[PDB]
Design a protein around this ligand. Structure first.
Ligand SMILES: [Ca+2]
Ligand SMILES: [Ca+2]
Ligand SMILES: [Ca+2]
Ligand SMILES: [Ca+2]
Ligand SMILES: [Ca+2]
Ligand SMILES: [Ca+2]
Lengths: 209, 194
């Protein structure tokens, strides 16, 4: 938990209240005191003894990296050593629900449209880290109304939110029989893979032409 | 003490983690997980959730550990759902209440049932005989509970036709086409008198 002044990177989970110092910098005479600059945000502090710490739980969605610099000073306040870059990587936790860009979508599809060919897109946004499951979204049709004998007329690309006819929907959609369908779409984060995830829903009304 | 979540059925394309200190790895390594002498931790071929879903590893410094390193093996759809029977023999009373089950068909899926990979969707593929394209039978697409329709309750008549065959399908990925496996099974149903 101590060592020379040099470029270093520390990884700290957002939402963790501090319990111990991050690091102690040691610098031989003529290193008197230490100075901390950069994206301190009144969170990151260095003491005279070279003790580096953070004073409150971070939030990746306020700042996802804190670019700091540490320098060793002498008696006259004059830089002796560094300034060196000290990087804080604020590790993501799943603390944001995914939200649909619309609570209601209005679409239309032609009667004999190709199966798999998109005619509408639903999208959601998640403020968590997209390089992690926390920010990786999975789209599902949860309801089709009306639905005949459990045959799905519509399918959604689970990654992209692209809504297209199924094989059966291509074959069966007939505006005279039924001019419109309502889909309820879910989105989950954690890539749709957990129970331990957040979810949103939207409604899509679709006219058959 | 760290957790890493690695999909099964992927050839390693990245290291798991570089520890900064000599390191020893112990625990459920299964000659797949390796740590270099200087703490580069990595896996040397594709995991299989259905062989081992968590790998409980320990990393020690040589003094500092051992620490539990947990590998959560994330599921992919690599198992077809299967019915518990290839043939079911059912019986339903004439005028039985619509929607009241009289038979269950079941499937199991070796993939994770907390994911779409293990999430099954039951359908009636075909009712024989069928009159005028009217379904006498319905199935609960979550449970595989088979019951009469309103039409079936009103029409089934063992004097006119005492037996029907259903072909039932089960799909995983919650029954959507793309990336899903499927099984089918036969149900013979006798209609008894009221
Ligand atoms: Ca946050
Ligand atoms: Ca999220
Ligand atoms: Ca977050
Ligand atoms: Ca497997
Ligand atoms: Ca499966
Ligand atoms: Ca699997």
């Amino acid at each position: 938990f101590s060592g020379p002044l040099k470029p270093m990177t520390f990884s700290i989970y957002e939402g963790q209240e501090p319990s111990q110092i991050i690091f102690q910098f040691k610098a031989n005479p003529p290193a008197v005191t230490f100075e901390l600059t950069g994206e301190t945000d009144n969170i990151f502090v260095i003491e005279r003894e070279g003790l580096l710490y953070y004073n409150r739980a971070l939030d990746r969605e306020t700042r996802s990296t804190h670019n700091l610099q540490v320098a060793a000073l002498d008696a006259n306040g004059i830089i002796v050593e560094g300034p060196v870059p000290i990087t804080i990587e604020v590790k993501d936790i799943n603390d944001n629900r995914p939200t649909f860009l619309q609570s209601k979508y209005e679409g239309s599809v032609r009667q004999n449209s190709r199966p798999g060919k998109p005619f509408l897109y639903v999208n959601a946004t998640d403020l968590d880290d997209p390089a992690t499951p926390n920010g990786q979204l999975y789209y599902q049709i949860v309801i089709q109304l009306p639905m005949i004998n459990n045959v799905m007329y519509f399918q959604i690309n689970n990654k992209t939110g692209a809504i297209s006819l199924t094989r059966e929907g291509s074959q069966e959609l007939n505006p005279a029989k039924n001019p419109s369908y309502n889909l309820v779409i879910s989105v989950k984060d954690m890539g749709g893979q957990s129970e331990n995830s957040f979810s949103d829903t939207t409604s899509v009304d679709i006219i058959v032409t």
